[PDB]
């Protein structure tokens with residue numbers, strides 16, 4: 001693999017509780033320092049990356065509920081003030097919007113009737129927040145008007161806990177996945193959904209949320225067990241289960257256009273697998289860099305795999321440190337791909353700089 | 356090719372997102 005990294009630093013957080021999520025703020029402009037947030041237990045912690053591998057602790061948000069367990073975080077910005085924002089959620093099923101400058105919760109949404117596994121912001125509209133829950137549904141929120149735009153679930157929605165979801169690059173559609181082994185497509189560029197988003201903006205103080213009972217595509221033919229991580233790779237999909245492989249696939253037949261796929265489409269095309277080892281426990285996430293040239297995944301014994309996505313056989317770099325032995329739950333690349341951060345179950349953070 | 360046509364879509368769409376990011380001035384944390 002052409003990609004090479006050096007481990008330049010590591011630290012363990014004071015509380016010693018596991019770290020489950022990590023996200024670099026890809027909204028920061030050139031000249032501003034590279035910042036990442038970590039989530040685990042009832043804590044959200046902010047760090048700044050400096051020269052000579054320095055990882056500088058900024059501040060932490062501590063939830064009054066000692067029993068809250070944050071599983072996810074996502075960055076956005078306030079379109080009116082240009083200031084950054086951070087959304088966090090987990091076991092309590094409550095979505096908190098944190099001001100990262102002061103690390104205080106500015107507002108919260110009683111998100112779901114159960115735990116939230118993932119949060120994602122729309123790539124073009126910073127106010128559109130997607131939450132995925134153990135209640136079998138996905139919810140789309142407008143954080144400018146504090147409205148619930150839509151609920152994706154019901155009649156043909158997921159039949160078990162939703163574990164992951166992802167918007168495609170231009171934010172026209174969402175692919176979700178869960179414990180029912182299915183991967184479901186939900187178009188948000190439909191006339192119904194574009195109008196519902198427009199309406200949530202027109203709202204001013206209850207807003208009537210859309211109930212989307214039927215996806216635009218559904219498959220149970222990729223994985224034979226829970227699907228705990230899904231990401232778009234252009235018009236293709238990357239998804240994983242417990243079989244030590246990330247499967248690259250697409251709805252329909254080989255030649256079929258994603259935008260021409262009918263909701264009743266029965267076929268799937270499997271293009272290949274990215275194979276690895278010792279990553280068969282649940283809740284292990286993979287990530288990509290901004291340009292989607294690199295794919296990263298940590299395993300249960302602290303190895304970090306990095307694949308070069310610019311292929312047709314994909315070359316793989318294995319990053320290891322003799323002191324890194326705990327399960328790597330999530331990884332995050334800085335926007336310029338110069339830094340890769342991995343977070344672990346033993347509360348450790350690992351910094352890998354690209355050579 | 357399948358992967359080559361897919362790479363061009365990634366390049367074009369990430370370029371659109373990068374141009375939108377370049378036009379923005381988000382205040383530091």
Ligand SMILES: N#Cc1c2c(c3nncn3c1NCc1ccco1)CN(Cc1ccccc1)CC2
Nearest residue numbers: 018020071117163164228229283284285329345
């Ligand atoms: N990450 C996470 C995550 C995890 C647990 C979870 N339970 N329900 C949802 N969950 C998660 N959702 C986020 C998610 C959705 C898809 C992928 O990640 C249970 N943990 C058990 C544990 C606790 C303390 C130490 C070691 C192991 C592991 C982490």
